Amino acid sequence: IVGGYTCGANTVPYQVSLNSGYHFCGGSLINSQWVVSAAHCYKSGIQVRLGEDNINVVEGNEQFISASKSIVHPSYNSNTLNNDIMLIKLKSAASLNSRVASISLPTSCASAGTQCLISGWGNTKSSGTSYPDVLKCLKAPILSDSSCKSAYPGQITSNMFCAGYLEGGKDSCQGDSGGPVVCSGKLQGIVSWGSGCAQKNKPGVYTKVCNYVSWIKQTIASN
Ligand SMILES: O=c1cc(C(F)(F)F)c2c([nH]1)CCC2
Ligand SMILES: [Ca+2]
C-alpha cells in the first residue's frame, strides 16, 4: 500500500497473509473454513496466516493453518486477469473472535463514489521498494466505469473496477495482491492489478466480487 496508514494491530480481522516460506499475497476470511484471494496468487504449499499484524514477529493472536484445497475460478485468464479470483479451504476451521473474523459477501454491487478500505503488506513505495512488517490501510473510493476504462483502454472487463485516486499518490502495490477491498462492511473487491503503483491516471484495478457470490456460495456448499 502506497500512501496509506498503519491500520493498527488486528483492526482488519478478516485480512489474511498467504505464506509459502514468506508472505506473498493477501486474502480475506469469508467463513471459518474459507479464504477468498486472487487467482494470480495461486501456488501449491500455502499456509494461511490469520490474526497477523507484524508478519515477522509472533505477537500472540495468530492462527497458522495450511490450505487443504485451492480452487481457481474456472474462467480465470492469466493474460487478461479476467476472473481473478480463487478460493482456499483451510485444513481446520479458524477460531473466530474479535481479532479473527469473517467478512460478509456483498448482496449487491457497490457504486462509483463508495468509500472502501484496502489493506495489505505490499510495497509502500511508488518508486523503489520497501516492504512493511505491519498491516497498512488505505481509504479509497470506487471510480466510475468510464474513468476506469479511460485509464486503461482495452483492459477493463465487466469483472473489474478501479478504486483510488487519479491524481496518484495513494494505491495498492506489489504484495497487496489478493487482499480485500471492503465497503460498508462487505467484501466488494480483491486486489488484482495495476500499472506501477500510485501513478497519475493509473489507479488500482480490483476483481468485482459481487459477480462471483453465486459461484462462491455453491463452491463452498459442495467442497
Ligand atoms: O505492479 C502492480 C501489482 C499490483 C498487484 F500485484 F496486484 F498487487 C498492483 C499494482 N501494481 C497497483 C495496484 C495493485
Ligand atoms: Ca505476527
Q: Is 215 exposed, middle or buried (0-12, 13-18, 19+ CB in 10 A)?
A: middle
Residues 198 and 120 placed together within one structural domain of the fold: yes
- Residues contacting residue 87 through CB under 8 Å, at least 6 positions apart: 34, 35, 36, 37, 70, 71, 216, 219, 220, 223
Contact predicate 15/30, CB 8 Å:
no
End-to-end CA separation in angstroms for the chain: 33
Measure Cα distances from 148 to 55, 95, 106, 155, 187 in Å.
33, 39, 21, 9, 20
Identify the residues whose C-beta falls under 6 Å from ligand 1: 122, 171-174, 176-177, 191-194, 197, 204
Contact predicate 168/201, CB 8 Å:
yes
Please choose, from the candidates 42, 49, 51, the residue with its C-alpha nearest in 3D space to the C-alpha of residue 90.
49
* Ligand in nearest proximity to the CA of 174: 1
- How far apart CA 223 and CA 220 sit, in angstroms, is 5
Contact predicate 143/154, CB 8 Å:
no
Residues 118 and 183 placed together within one structural domain of the fold: yes
Residues 49 and 67 placed together within one structural domain of the fold: yes
Amino acid at 110: A
Contact predicate 170/136, CB 8 Å:
no
Structural domain containing residue 89: 13-102+211-222
Please choose, from the candidates 66, 173, 71, the residue with its C-alpha nearest in 3D space to the C-alpha of residue 124.
173
* 119 is annotated as an active-site residue: no
User: DSSP labels for the chain?
Assistant: -BS-EE--TTSSTTEEEEESSSEEEEEEEEETTEEEE-GGG--SS-EEEES-SSTTS--S--EEEEEEEEEE-TT--TTT-TT--EEEEESSPPPP-SSS-PPBPPSSPPPTT-EEEEEES----SSS----SS-EEEEEEBPPHHHHHHHSTTT--TTEEEES-TT-S-B--TT-TT-EEEETTEEEEEEEE-SSSSBTTB-EEEEEGGGGHHHHHHHHHH-
Amino acid at 105: L
Contact predicate 190/209, CB 8 Å:
yes
The domain total for the chain is 2
Give the residue whose CA is nearest to atom 3 of ligand 1: 174
Q: Quick one: CA torsion of 33, 38, 39, 41, rounded to 10 degrees?
A: -90
Residues 5 and 61 placed together within one structural domain of the fold: no
* 84 is annotated as an active-site residue: yes
Contact predicate 122/174, CB 8 Å:
yes
Please choose, from the candidates 170, 182, 159, the residue with its C-alpha nearest in 3D space to the C-alpha of residue 39.
159
| Ligand 1 centroid distance, CA of 97 (Å) | 31
Residues 37 and 108 placed together within one structural domain of the fold: no
C-alpha 57, offset from chain centre: 22
Q: Is 28 annotated as a binding residue?
A: no
- Residues contacting residue 60 through CB under 8 Å, at least 6 positions apart: none
Q: Quick one: CA torsion of 49, 55, 61, 65, rounded to 10 degrees?
A: 20
Residues 182 and 109 placed together within one structural domain of the fold: yes
* 130 is annotated as an active-site residue: no
Residues 195 and 150 placed together within one structural domain of the fold: yes
For residue 10, give the C-alpha cell. 488486528
Please choose, from the candidates 6, 10, 76, 65, the residue with its C-alpha nearest in 3D space to the C-alpha of residue 34.
65
Residues 59 and 108 placed together within one structural domain of the fold: no
**Structural resolution in Å:** 1.1
Residue 136: how many CA atoms within 13 Å on its side-chain side? 23
The CATH number given to whatever domain includes residue 115 is 2.40.10.10
Contact predicate 181/189, CB 8 Å:
yes
For residue 188, give the C-alpha cell. 466488494
